[PDB]
């Protein structure tokens, strides 16, 4: 995705770990975001 100057990115590991709403939502569809997580309670699962 697009990154701002000074922002953390794979190309800029020293950048600030601050992300905008739009940037965060763009990462919602990557493969790592689609893996099922490990959770203790089940009632909140669809």
């Amino acid at each position: 995705i697009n990154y701002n100057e000074g922002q953390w990115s794979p190309n800029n590991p020293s950048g600030k770990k601050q992300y905008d709403r739009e940037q965060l939502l763009q990462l919602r569809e990557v493969k790592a975001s689609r893996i099922q997580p490990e959770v203790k309670n089940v009632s909140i699962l669809p």
Partner: protein, 170 residues
């Protein structure tokens, strides 16, 4: 593999209404991708049982105002005059993205967020550390109003946990 790390570790909580014992620690995460891995596989706030809560707090802060981390703080409360599936899910998710993304200048003052599903009314709250830090509370409040496009259907009020009067109203 190449995940985007978050500035803080976050823990998701789920309170199920019944007779502290009902606060349940769901899981913790510290990257953007691990957050979406969690959010994409759990019920949205519009689908959880009446009387339940979701909470997202920095690691080892419990969603309990009497705990030392929250005792001296307050909360920005968002109310919906007319509730709907769309506003509930969109507002909650947008609040979570503000938190994990560190969208506020006063990041250190944010403890977490809570959404109460209470049927005919619903509340979304952002808990801060010190209710006397006027600069931080107002900066967070103004950011919420803009980032969430709050308007006529909403009221933005800052209330001390110890208190029902409000300290600020936006």
């Amino acid at each position: 593999h190449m995940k985007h790390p978050l500035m803080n570790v976050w823990t998701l909580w789920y309170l199920e209404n019944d007779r502290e014992d009902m606060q349940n620690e769901i899981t913790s995460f510290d990257t953007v991708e691990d957050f979406w891995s969690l959010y994409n596989h759990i019920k949205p706030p519009s689908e959880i049982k009446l009387g339940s809560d979701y909470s997202l707090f920095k690691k080892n802060i419990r969603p309990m105002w009497e705990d030392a981390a929250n005792k001296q703080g307050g909360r920005w409360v968002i109310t919906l005059n007319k509730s709907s599936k769309t506003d509930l899910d969109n507002l909650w998710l947008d609040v979570l993205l503000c938190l994990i993304g560190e969208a506020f200048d006063h990041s250190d003052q944010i403890c977490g967020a809570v959404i109460n599903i209470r049927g005919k009314s619903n509340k979304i709250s952002i808990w801060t550390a010190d209710g006397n830090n006027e600069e931080a509370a107002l900066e967070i409040g103004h950011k919420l109003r803009d980032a969430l496009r709050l308007g006529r259907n909403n009221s933005l009020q800052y209330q001390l946990h110890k208190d029902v009067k409000s300290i600020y109203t936006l």
